[PDB]
Design a protein around this ligand. Structure first.
Ligand SMILES: CCCCCCCC/C=C\CCCCCCCC(=O)OC[C@H](COP(=O)(O)OCCN)OC(=O)CCCCCCC/C=C\CCCCCCCC
Ligand SMILES: CCCCCCCC/C=C\CCCCCCCC(=O)OC[C@H](COP(=O)(O)OCCN)OC(=O)CCCCCCC/C=C\CCCCCCCC
Ligand code: HEM
Ligand code: HEM
Ligand SMILES: CO/N=C(/C(=O)OC)c1ccccc1CO/N=C(/C)c1cccc(C(F)(F)F)c1
Lengths: 101, 80, 61, 380, 109
């Protein structure tokens, strides 16, 4: 029914990056694919991500978090990178597959 | 050269005061402690549990080991 | 205002700052040791040789 | 050449690019304070070590008493001896927190910095092992015996390797003198490798507690971290000294205040606390060969950590399931430490195997598994 | 680095040669500020409003000529040495950094 959705929303809150004002995609480890995707982000999305991240690092050093009002809500989290990232991986797998043939 | 080649950054303003214009340990009661408590609270149920379990297992095993050193009167009840 | 006097006379010029540390250390040592030893002995009255020494120090045989 | 001599000079430039103008994340916590403590710890062991070495005599007939002569006659020899023996523990406490931090924050993703790290640990253990034998007390001798005899269990080359290591048929003077040489030597290899450690590290720079790029917010190592680290130094150094000055023998075995005697086996042959966890695993596998492999694996397992990362995120800061698994593992280690100090009997035997088994399971199966599971819960 | 460096030189090791030249440059500058009617008028309006009177070049020169190395050092030390400055940076400023580091550039020549 709505079980998968209950779990996700639960994990989302348990994770807690939303308390730093970060988007799920803001928290991705920057391996190669992720690095390429980031280079493809439009300027505005890229600067917003940068501010969010800088802001989180500053909270982190201060040992504070954002006020509860400013926390990112599960349903308002914008998966801004997932689209690019999936494409980057699709391309990689194409080349990998092709270079084997 | 590691300062100047790090990240493309735009439109962020920051404001900071000299250390001599501000206090070293400000708002201990209004901000510090509350947060300390906040931090402790958010973690205790993640850290404490297994340590508590460790303690139990420890206590059991220590007491169980001593109990096995004691004698069981049921081995001498018919030794007349 | 000592803080200002201190600042002007001692902490402003890096040279006087070092001088204040050195001369400061010399005086701190003399004081700090005397006090520590004093505290230690008081907490141990009549237990140290310093304390019982007189009983055999030129008062036997 | 260049304006300031801090950048142009071939040496100061090095000092500057690693301790002054070195870009550090603005948010690294106290957990990042252990690297510097490890370094300072190392310089201190080497220093007190040399001072002790200048009064030691590597001979079965004089070792024990040379250490006693040092503690009883050398000016402050007793203090230096204390600082050296206890410093070894400060070293391991620090190294274990250093590693922990790394596991929790995914520092291991910096593969080379990590592998050299594993090598530093191994070298540190060998150093302390050979060091421990030098006073030639009862635990010195029997610990040396118990552990070195394990290798005669290796197939075919076994007995050889062992009699080669001892330089005879048992732990005896020839073993002692070569152990002194090794103990004097290895610390210098640790210093060397430590440089390589930091060299690889500087390729990437420090990781941070949120696990996201800190390029957007870096600050110079000095004064921020030089101060933070000096503070960290005094904060740790206090309990260290408190222990060494008020409870000198708290961590040592009384059995070592008795000259080694090959004709009297101590009742409970057990190592210093920092080896207990491994001793427990050793004894968990009844079978000379299997236990040895298990012991070996208990530390070599660290070389696999970089390949068992499945999470899409670097740290565990935002991974609550992994966080508990992490503390489960920590508790798992206290338990092994505890089992390591106990005799081999029920219920310590069964508990021991449980702990040994869960240890490997958590690192080999659960961590990677839970990581994948978490990736799904983020809709990834 | 060099800039703050020069400020520290001002407070600790100014030379008579430097001030000697500095004065001549300053004299020319004040004279050059009265090159035309608009600029002379600007001076009068300003002087009155700020000094409550006019200060003739003849006076300025008198004052300017009384300055020497020793004086520059004392005045500068008095306003610059070990003071917390105000900093404004705009643009691609990642390589300039840390108020603390800058604050330290405020002492020891
Ligand atoms: C009897 C003893 C007398 C003789 C002892 C001689 C020792 C004297 C030393 C010289 C004086 C030092 C001069 C310092 C001047 C440089 C300076 O700027 O200050 C240091 C400077 C501070 O910067 P500012 O606050 O911005 O100062 C600006 C001044 N306008 O840097 C510091 O923070 C250094 C002071 C903190 C020391 C921290 C050390 C912590 C260590 C503790 C463990 C114990 C030691 C064991 C040693 C091991 C040896 C084997
Ligand atoms: C290994 C040898 C075994 C020897 C015994 C192990 C040492 C036992 C001593 C217990 C350790 C004391 C630490 C207690 C501190 C509790 C604490 O603060 O936990 C919460 C806190 C929350 O952090 P964030 O998620 O980033 O929060 C950010 C937003 N506020 O977690 C941390 O500080 C991170 C934990 C890192 C330190 C780990 C120290 C334990 C060391 C053990 C080594 C284990 C690893 C593997 C070794 C195998 C060989
Ligand atoms: C004699 C032992 C060692 C010395 C002197 C040493 C020193 C250092 C120093 C100075 C740093 C930088 C500061 C810090 O982050 O703590 C560092 C970082 C690191 N060390 Fe070590 N280390 C030692 C052992 C190890 C071990 C055993 C491991 C892992 C098995 C290790 C893994 C790392 C890694 C992965 C980093 C990255 C930290 C980050 O995430 O930013 N080190 N070490
Ligand atoms: C990596 C740093 C070192 C470690 C971890 C270490 C560890 C140890 C240990 C555990 C002992 C036994 C202490 C005891 O209980 O009596 C010891 C003893 C000794 N070490 Fe080291 N040591 C180190 C470096 C050195 C160095 C560099 C030297 C000198 C070149 C040295 C010289 C000695 C000597 C002579 C003893 C014998 C005296 C004694 O037992 O106190 N050590 N060391
Ligand atoms: C010479 O023995 N030194 C001992 C000691 O406590 O030094 C601090 C000791 C003491 C009692 C039992 C076992 C040991 C030996 O160490 N024991 C184990 C179980 C061990 C485990 C892993 C690695 C290593 C080594 F080789 F250092 F690399 C050793």
């Amino acid at each position: 029914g709505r079980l998968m959705d209950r779990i996700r929303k639960w994990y989302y809150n348990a994770a807690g990056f939303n308390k730093y004002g970060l988007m799920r995609d803001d928290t991705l480890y920057e391996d190669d694919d992720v690095k390429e995707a980031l280079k493809r982000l439009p300027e505005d999305l890229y600067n917003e991500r940068m501010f969010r991240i800088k802001r989180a690092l500053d909270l982190s050093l201060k040992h504070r978090i954002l006020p509860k009002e400013q926390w990112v809500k599960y349903e308002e989290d914008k998966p801004y990178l997932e689209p690019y990232l999936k494409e980057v991986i699709r391309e990689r797998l194409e080349r990998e597959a092709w270079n084997k043939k | 050269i590691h300062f100047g080649n790090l990240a493309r950054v735009r439109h962020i303003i920051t404001y900071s005061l000299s250390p001599f214009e501000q206090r070293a340990i400000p708002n201990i009661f209004s901000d510090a402690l509350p947060n300390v408590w906040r931090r402790f609270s958010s973690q205790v149920f993640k850290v404490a549990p297994p340590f508590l379990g460790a303690y139990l297992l420890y206590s059991w095993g220590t007491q169980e080991f001593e109990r096995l050193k004691r004698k069981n009167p049921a081995d001498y009840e018919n030794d007349q | 205002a000592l803080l200002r006097q201190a600042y002007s006379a001692l902490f402003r010029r890096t040279s006087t700052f070092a001088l204040t540390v050195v001369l400061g250390a010399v005086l701190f040592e003399r004081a700090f040791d005397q006090g520590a030893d004093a505290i230690f002995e008081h907490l141990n009255e009549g237990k140290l040789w310093k304390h019982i020494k007189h009983k055999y120090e030129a008062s036997e045989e | 050449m260049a304006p300031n001599i801090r950048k142009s000079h071939p040496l100061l430039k090095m000092i500057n690019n690693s301790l002054i103008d070195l870009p550090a994340p603005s948010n690294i916590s106290a957990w990042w304070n252990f690297g510097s403590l490890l370094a300072v710890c190392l310089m201190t062991q080497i220093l007190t070590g040399l001072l002790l070495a200048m009064h030691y005599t590597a001979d079965t007939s004089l070792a024990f008493s040379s250490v006693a002569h040092t503690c009883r006659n050398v000016q402050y020899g007793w203090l230096i001896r204390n600082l050296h023996a206890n410093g070894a523990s400060f070293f391991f406490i620090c190294i274990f927190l250093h590693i922990g931090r790394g596991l929790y924050y995914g520092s291991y993703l910096y593969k080379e910095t990590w592998n050299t790290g594993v090598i530093l640990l191994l070298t540190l253990m060998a150093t302390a092992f050979v060091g421990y034998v030098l006073p030639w007390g009862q635990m010195s001798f029997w610990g040396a015996t118990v552990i070195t005899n394990l290798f005669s269990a290796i197939p075919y080359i076994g007995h050889t390797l062992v009699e080669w290591a001892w330089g005879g048929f048992s732990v005896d003077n020839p073993t002692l003198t070569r152990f002194f040489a090794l103990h004097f030597l290895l610390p210098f290899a640790i210093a060397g490798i430590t440089i390589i450690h930091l060299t690889f590290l500087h390729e990437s720079g420090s990781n941070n507690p949120l696990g996201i790029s800190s390029d957007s917010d870096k600050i110079p190592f000095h004064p921020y971290y030089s101060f933070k680290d000096i503070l960290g130094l005094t904060l740790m150094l206090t309990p260290f000294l408190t222990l060494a000055l008020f409870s000198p023998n708290l961590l040592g075995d009384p059995e070592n205040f008795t000259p080694a005697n090959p004709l009297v086996t101590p009742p409970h042959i057990k190592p210093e606390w920092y080896f207990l966890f491994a001793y427990a695993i050793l004894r968990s596998i009844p079978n000379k060969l299997g236990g040895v492999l298990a012991l070996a694996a208990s530390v070599l397992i660290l070389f696999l950590i970089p390949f068992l990362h499945k999470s899409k995120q670097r740290t565990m800061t935002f991974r609550p399931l992994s966080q508990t698994l992490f503390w489960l593992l920590v508790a798992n280690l206290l338990i092994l430490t505890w089992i390591g100090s106990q005799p081999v009997e029920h219920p310590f035997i069964i508990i021991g195997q449980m702990a040994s088994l869960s240890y490997f399971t958590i690192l080999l199966i659960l961590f990677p598994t839970i990581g994948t599971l978490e990736n799904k819960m983020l809709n990834y | 680095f060099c800039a703050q460096g020069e400020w520290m030189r001002l407070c600790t090791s100014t030379t008579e040669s430097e001030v000697k030249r500095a004065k001549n440059h300053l004299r020319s500058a004040m004279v050059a500020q009265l090159d035309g009617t608009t600029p002379v008028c600007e001076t009068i309006g300003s002087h009155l409003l700020n000094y409550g009177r006019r200060i003739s070049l003849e006076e300025w020169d008198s004052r300017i000529s009384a300055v020497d190395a020793r004086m520059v050092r004392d005045v500068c030390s008095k306003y610059i040495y070990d003071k917390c400055p105000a900093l404004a940076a705009v643009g691609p400023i990642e390589q300039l950094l840390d108020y603390n580091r800058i604050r330290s550039g405020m002492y020891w020549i």
